[PDB]
Structure 1
Amino acid sequence: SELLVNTKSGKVMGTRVPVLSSHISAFLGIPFAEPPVGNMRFRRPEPKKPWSGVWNASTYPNNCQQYVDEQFPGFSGSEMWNPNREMSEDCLYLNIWVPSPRPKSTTVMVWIYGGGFYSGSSTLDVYNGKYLAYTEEVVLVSLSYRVGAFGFLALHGSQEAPGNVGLLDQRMALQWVHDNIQFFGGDPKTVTIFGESAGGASVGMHILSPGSRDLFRRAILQSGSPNCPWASVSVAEGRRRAVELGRNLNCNLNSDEELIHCLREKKPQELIDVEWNVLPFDSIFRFSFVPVIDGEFFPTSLESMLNSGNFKKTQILLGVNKDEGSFFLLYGAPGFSKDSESKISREDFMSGVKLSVPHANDLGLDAVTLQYTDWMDDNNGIKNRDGLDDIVGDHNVICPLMHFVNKYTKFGNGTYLYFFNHRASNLVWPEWMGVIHGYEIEFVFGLPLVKELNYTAEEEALSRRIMHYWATFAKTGNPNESKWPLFTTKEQKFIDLNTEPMKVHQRLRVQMCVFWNQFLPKLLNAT
C-alpha cells in the first residue's frame, strides 16, 4: 500500500519524505543482516531472520562504529562526513528511496559509501538519495557495511574473523536488494551499484569477486577502484595488523582465537581508539583494516584478475576528481592547514612525498620527486603544494583507477570515464584543496537542487546533468539518452564534469600514471 511494503524478509512500514516540490516513499533502516553484535563481531554477516509485523522503516538506522573526525569540530567540511546517528555495531541496515507513485519496476541504484573503509554512514546528508530517486525516477537504496576492524579484521586462518567481512555485508545488502527490490518497484536485473572512495573501490571489488558478480548489473565507481594501494592488503598484512591492534589493546596474541576473543570483548571504542596504531608505515591515504586478498572473496591478486579479465563484464561509469589528494595532505601532511594557503616548503614537500609513497625506497621517492618537482622553481610553495596534491592524488586515486579502467575496458561492455573538475561554489574548505575528493557526491545526489544549500543555478544544472548521466546509465548502461564518449583503450576519451560545456579529453594524467602504473613499481621491484 504505497508506504507499506511486504518483502521476503517481512512487511516493512516506510515513510513518505518530502522531496523538492513533492513527496517520496522512503524506507529507512531495513535490516539486511543479523546485528553483527555479540560473538559475531568480525564474523561474516548472517542474513536477517524474517521478521513479523511491519518493520518501521521511517527513521535512519544507526551508523557502524567508526573513527569520528574531530580534526575540525563543527566544521561542516569535516563533520558532514561524520556518523550523524548513534553509532552502534548493530548498523547493518539499508535505506530505500522509492519514487511516488511507486514504480512497478524501474532502475535500482545501490550506493556504497566511501571513507577508506574506516568510516562511512549511509545516513549522511549528502547521501540522502531522495533527490536522486525523485529527479531520476530511480529506486535508490544506500546500504551500510561494517567499517574498520569491526568489518575488516583479517586473521586469515580463522573463520571467527576472516577478512572482507564488511565486504560481505555489502554483498548481503546487495543480495537483499536482489531478492526484494521488486516489492519496492525496483528492477532487480537493473541494479547499478555506485560508490565513492572506498565505496567506489568496494563496487569494484564486487565486479571482481565471483560471489557478487551476479547481484548487480552495472557499476559506477567514483574516485575509487579495487586496485588501489589503500584499498587492499595481503592476508598476511591483515593478520599482522590484526595482531598489532591486538597488541595495542593488550591482548593475548597467542592464537587467533585468544586474540579474537580478546578483541570481541573490547568495547567498540577500544578498537577505534588504537586502530590507527597498526599501519606499518608513517603515511597518507592508507588505512589499517581494509579488504584482505583472501582467495575466497578475491580469487587472486586483483591484478591477476584484472589481467586475465577474470571479472564481471558490464558497462561501468567511473571517474576521478581534479584534486584527490588535497584532503589527505591537509589532514596528515605537514605544512598544510585549513586556514592557510598551505604553501608547502621544499623541506616539507619531501616530507609529503615520504608520506604519500610509504613503500618507496629512497630511489622511489627520488623518482617521484623528479616527476613532481618543478626544477625551474623547486622552492615554489604553491608548486610544491599542488605537486603533493597530485602525488597523493594520482598515486592513490587517479592512477590505480586509470589502471582498472584500462584493464577492464579490454573486456567489459563499455566504459564511461569522467574527470570532475568543479569546486562547488559553496564549498567551505580552503580554495587550495580545489576540487576535493568526495565533493562530487553532493552533485551526484542532487544537493544543488535544494536552494537552502545555495549553489549557483549553474551548479544545479551540473547536478541534474550528473544525476541524469548516472541514472540514464543505471537504466540503459549508457550515460547518454554532447555525446559522452565511450572509453576505449585506443583513443581513451573521457569528459570533464563541470559547469562548462562538457568537453572531451583523452588519456587522463597519462604522463604521470605511466610512471605510477608502469615505471615506479618496476623501479621499486628492481631496487
Structure 2
Amino acid sequence: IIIATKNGKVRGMQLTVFGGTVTAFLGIPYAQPPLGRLRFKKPQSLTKWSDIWNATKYANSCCQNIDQSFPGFHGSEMWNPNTDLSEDCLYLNVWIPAPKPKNATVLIWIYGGGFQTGTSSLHVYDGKFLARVERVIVVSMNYRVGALGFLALPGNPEAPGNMGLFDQQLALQWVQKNIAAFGGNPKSVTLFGESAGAASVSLHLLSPGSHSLFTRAILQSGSFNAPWAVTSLYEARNRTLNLAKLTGCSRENETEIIKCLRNKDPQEILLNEAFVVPYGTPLSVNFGPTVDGDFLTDMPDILLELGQFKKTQILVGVNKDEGTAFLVYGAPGFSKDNNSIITRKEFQEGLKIFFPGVSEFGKESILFHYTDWVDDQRPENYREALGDVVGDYNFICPALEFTKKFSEWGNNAFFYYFEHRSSKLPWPEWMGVMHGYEIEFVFGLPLERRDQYTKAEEILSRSIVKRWANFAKYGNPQETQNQSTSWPVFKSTEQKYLTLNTESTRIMTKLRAQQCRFWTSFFPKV
C-alpha cells in the first residue's frame, strides 16, 4: 500500500477484481504543474515531497474542449473527461498485480482524442483488468492537448511545440526510474495507444530521446503518417498567430506574444482554438505535433522512409469502420438517429466537408475511385462510400503504409483487422465497427460478466488480452494454448494480417489493396 518512489512515498488502494486483488495508484504527479510562467513550456522535473502522496483517485484532466454534439448520449459522452479540467494535470496511474510482482512487464497507455481531447481516467482505459488477468503493470498518463500542449513558435523555447509529446516522454522517464519499486521491469516496457495515442506511440519510435525509454510498441488505429497527425511549420506558425489575433495578443516580439497568451484564462484559449484554421473538418487537429528540432528532428515521413527509427517489434491494426464516427459531425444527410441513406449529391457535399482545401479534380478523383458500384441500385452505396473514404484516407491506408515501411528495415510486425461490433455499442448499426471501440476489448472490460457483454465477446476479449500481453512480454502476439490461429508476421511482399472477430479468426492478405494504392500513390499528388 506504501511504495517509496524517487520523489517521495505514495499510498495506493486495493481493488477487488475477479475474486483477486489489484493495487492501484491513481494520480501520481510526474512533473511540475505547467502553470503561470510554465504554460506552453516543456514539462519541468518534479521536486521531492516528504509526506505520503495519496494516489487514491484519478487526478485532474488537462484543459480541453468538450464534445457537446450529443448531450446525454453515452456514445459521445463516454469520451468526455470524467475529472475536473485543470492546467494542473501532469499525473499518471499505475495498476500493479497483487501480490506485488517480481519483474513484471509494463504496459504504458497513451490515449487518443485528436491531440485536442482525452484523459487517462476514462472507464475504457481502466488498467485493473489487465493487471489482474495477465499480471502486467499498466501505466497511463495525462498529457497536455490542444494549444496548451502543442502551440508552436518553432525554435522559441517559450512555446517550442510538442509539449504534450514531451509530457508523454517525461512519464516514460518516470517509469524507467521508479517502476522497479512497484515490481515492474523497466527493461520490458510496451507503449500502446489508440488514434492520436497511436500516432504518439509511432512518434516515440522516431524520437531519439524516447529510444531507451521503452521496448516495444502497439499502434491501434493510428500512425504519424496519417494526414491529421503532424502539422507543418507554416501551418503551426500561422495558427499560433491566428490565435494571437483572436485573443488580442498580436505583438511583434514573438516572446511578447507568448507572455500575452500566458495571462489569458484557459477558457479564452480553448474558445478560440477552433478558429485558427479558415476551413475546418471533423478531423481537424488545430494544434498537434510539429517538427520542432527536438522531439522530432526532421519530417517523420523522411525518417520512416530512410529507416531512422527504433528497431523493434510492432503490433499495428485498424477497425473495419474507422470513418463512420466522423460523418455525424458535419457530413450532410448523416444522423445517428436514422439510417443516413444519402444521395450522390449529398456524397459530393460530404467530400467538400472532409476535403475543403482540395481541388475539384482531387474531389472528383475520390468520387471516381469510390463510386463504381457492384450494384447501382443499393441505396446505402453513397453512405458506405463516404465512411470508407474517411476511414481509408485518415486511418487504414496510413497504418498499412507505416507497417510496410517499418517492416522493410528488418523488424517483426503484426497487423490486425478488428471487425467485431460491440453488442453494447450505443451508436446505430449502420456505423459498424467504429473508431475507438476495440479499446474496451483490449482493456478486458468484457471479462466482467456483470457487464452485459455476450459470452462470445468475453472469449474474444480474453484472446485479445492474451495476444497483447504476449506481444508485450515476448514480442510475439500468439495465443498458444487454445488451438488459436497463429498470427504471422506482416511482410512488405505478402502483407498478411489477422482478423479479430467472435466467429472465425482468419489470415488474410493485402488489406484495402485497391483503395490504398489510390490514397498512397495517387492522391498525395493532387
- CA distance in 1 between partners of 2:172 and 2:192 (Å): 12
Deviations 1:96-151 (A, max 9, x none): 00000010111100000000000010000000111111111100001110011110
**Which residue does the alignment assign to 1:491?**
494
- Identify if the C-alpha distance between structure 1 residues 253 and 327 changes in structure 2 by more than 3 Å, giving closer, same or farther: farther
- CA distance in 2 between partners of 1:133 and 1:413 (Å): 28
Answer whether contact 1:443 1:466 (CA < 8 A) is retained: yes
**Which residue does the alignment assign to 1:51?**
49
- CA distance in 2 between partners of 1:293 and 1:351 (Å): 33
Work out which of the residue numbers 408, 421, 429 in structure 2 matches 1:410: 408
Deviations 1:454-504 (A, max 9, x none): 110100111111111111110001101410111111111001111122101
Secondary structure at the residue paired with 2:210?
coil
Aligned residues: 521
> How far off its partner does 1:189 sit?
0.8
- CA distance in 2 between partners of 1:212 and 1:304 (Å): 18
Answer whether contact 1:194 1:222 (CA < 8 A) is retained: yes
**Which residue does the alignment assign to 2:197?**
199
> How far off its partner does 1:213 sit?
1.6
1:85-484 residue pairs with structure 2 within 5 A? 85-374=83-372, 381-480=379-478, 481=480, 482-484=485-487
Answer whether contact 1:374 1:383 (CA < 8 A) is retained: no
Answer whether contact 2:241 2:250 (CA < 8 A) is retained: no
Task: Provide the identity percentage.
Answer: 54
Structure 2: runs of 5 or more not aligned? none
Partner letter of residue 302 of structure 2? S
Answer whether contact 1:443 1:463 (CA < 8 A) is retained: yes
**Which residue does the alignment assign to 1:60?**
58
> How far off its partner does 1:260 sit?
1.2
- CA distance in 2 between partners of 1:186 and 1:355 (Å): 47
**Which residue does the alignment assign to 2:5?**
7
Structure 1: runs of 5 or more not aligned? none
Answer whether contact 2:155 2:292 (CA < 8 A) is retained: no
> How far off its partner does 1:341 sit?
0.6
Answer whether contact 1:285 1:392 (CA < 8 A) is retained: no
**Which residue does the alignment assign to 1:502?**
505
> How far off its partner does 1:411 sit?
1.6
- Identify if the C-alpha distance between structure 1 residues 379 and 264 changes in structure 2 by more than 3 Å, giving closer, same or farther: farther
- Identify if the C-alpha distance between structure 1 residues 379 and 281 changes in structure 2 by more than 3 Å, giving closer, same or farther: farther
Partner letter of residue 11 of structure 2? M
Answer whether contact 1:378 1:384 (CA < 8 A) is retained: no
> How far off its partner does 1:402 sit?
0.9
For normalisation by structure 2, the TM-score amounts to 0.97
Partner letter of residue 51 of structure 1? W
Answer whether contact 1:312 1:412 (CA < 8 A) is retained: no
For normalisation by structure 1, the TM-score amounts to 0.96
Work out which of the residue numbers 59, 74, 77 in structure 1 matches 2:75: 77
Partner letter of residue 507 of structure 2? V
Partner letter of residue 351 of structure 1? E
Secondary structure at the residue paired with 1:201?
helix
> How far off its partner does 1:379 sit?
7.8
Question: RMSD over aligned Cα, in angstroms?
Answer: 1.4
- CA distance in 1 between partners of 2:377 and 2:235 (Å): 37
Answer whether contact 1:346 1:378 (CA < 8 A) is retained: no
